[PDB]
Design a protein around this ligand. Structure first.
Ligand code: BOG
Ligand code: BOG
Length: 388
């Protein structure tokens, strides 16, 4: 089947604008649109270009005071370690109380997000965590399938397309932006891109926080995120190890691969200390690997990270990188580094916005989860709204 072919689809539920405004008051801006929640599966490609399937979520706004046409916003979700997790069902289970619904779809934005290869109803054997090409291919094809759904429902689209995403989703959003701008500008009239708290300077991000802490603070969840990265990069490039023991010490070597993705969420793992805390990193990674990474640019894992940097290009679309200076998980430095190379490449289309407190006393790995909704609102108001 051609990339983007819609395989299955169906509505899960719907929320009235009043019901959405109630959520907002409870959590005050008012919703303007009702939000229909749909799910779907489509045909796409694997990391080698081979056929694969993936699932996705589609939020459709509607209502008397919300006539179209609507802009199409592609969305990249954050790091997901639970293999069976489906965004659409999560929103439905959350009773529609999700920023995608309360902050975007309720304001007239059609939202489409892929669960990514290896997650949700995807048939991929693993998830290519932080792999630019497949994060982009999965998102692009999700938007393709969603358009088929929308065309069948006669949903009026303006034709304008936009991108956004949080955490790993910020990486996804930017990777998609780059791919569309380089090859699909006709098919996708991209008018705005707003990556949120993403590791655009991927390799730099891991190097800067390799010891366990960075200029901002302690990268508390780094062992979980780095382990997911190592395992995923191994599945994709198969150049890191023959078996887990070359990188991880026992007893984790034999448990790490089934975890990413697996039966546990990142939160489960952190709370039950499935993996050691950053203070015991030297007891976690093998000594050879741990010292080779920061001292050898040819290190296999480091090369795989570099291959997924999103720095060497010139963005053409008005871009708003959002994050917080308090964020110690994904330093806002990522945005600065990105912007510096973009300009150095002739592009002045990318701006940066900080939602931090300004008090280094608020610096924490935990500030990362706060940028999701804070940045969705800011990015919507300062850029998306302007470009629709
Ligand atoms: C969505 C992208 C998130 C990137 C998070 C990077 C967090 C890096 O965190 C670091 O990881 C290293 C390797 O595991 C560890 O050695 C360090 O102790 C840890 O602080
Ligand atoms: C970037 C991924 C980090 C995973 C480990 C930390 C998980 C912390 O738990 C998170 O706390 C947030 C509030 O602070 C909640 O909004 C999230 O639902 C919850 O999963």
């Amino acid at each position: 089947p051609a990339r983007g072919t819609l395989l299955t689809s169906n509505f899960l539920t719907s929320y009235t604008r009043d019901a959405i405004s109630a959520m907002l008051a409870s959590g005050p801006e008012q919703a303007k649109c009702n939000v229909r929640v749909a799910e779907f599966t489509y045909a796409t490609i694997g990391v080698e270009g081979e056929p694969a399937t993936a699932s996705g979520v589609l939020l459709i706004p509607g209502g008397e005071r919300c006539s179209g046409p609507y802009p199409l916003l592609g969305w990249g979700h954050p790091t997901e370690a639970l293999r069976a997790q489906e965004q659409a069902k999560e929103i439905r289970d959350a009773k529609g109380d999700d920023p995608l619904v309360t902050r975007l779809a309720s304001q007239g934005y059609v939202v489409v997000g892929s669960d990514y290869l290896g997650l949700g109803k995807s048939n991929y054997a693993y998830h290519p965590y932080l792999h630019s090409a497949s994060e982009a291919s999965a998102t692009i094809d999700a938007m393709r399938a969603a358009r088929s759904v929308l065309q069948h429902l006669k949903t009026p689209l303006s034709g304008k397309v936009m991108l956004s995403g949080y955490s790993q989703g910020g990486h996804t959003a930017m990777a998609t932006q780059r791919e569309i701008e380089a090859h699909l500008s006709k098919e996708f009239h991209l008018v705005a891109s707003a990556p949120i708290s993403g590791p655009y300077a991927l390799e730099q991000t891991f190097l800067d926080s390799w010891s366990g802490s960075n200029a901002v603070g302690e990268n508390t969840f780094g062992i979980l995120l780095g382990s997911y990265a190592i395992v995923a990069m191994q599945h994709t490039y198969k150049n890191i190890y023959l078996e887990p023991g070359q990188v991880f010490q026992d007893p984790w070597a034999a448990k790490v691969e089934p975890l990413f993705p697996g039966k546990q969420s990142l939160t489960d793992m952190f709370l039950n200390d499935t993996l050691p805390s950053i203070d015991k990193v030297k007891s976690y990674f093998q000594p050879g690997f741990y010292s080779d990474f920061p001292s050898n640019p040819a290190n296999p894992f480091r090369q795989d990270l570099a291959r997924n940097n999103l720095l060497e290009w010139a963005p053409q679309t008005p871009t708003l990188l959002c994050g917080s200076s308090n964020d110690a998980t994904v330093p806002l430095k990522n945005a600065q580094t990105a912007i510096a190379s973009f300009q150095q490449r002739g592009s002045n289309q990318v701006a940066l916005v900080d939602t931090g407190t300004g008090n280094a006393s608020d610096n924490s790995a935990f500030a990362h989860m706060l940028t999701k909704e804070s940045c969705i609102v800011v990015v919507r108001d300062q850029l998306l709204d302007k470009q629709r």
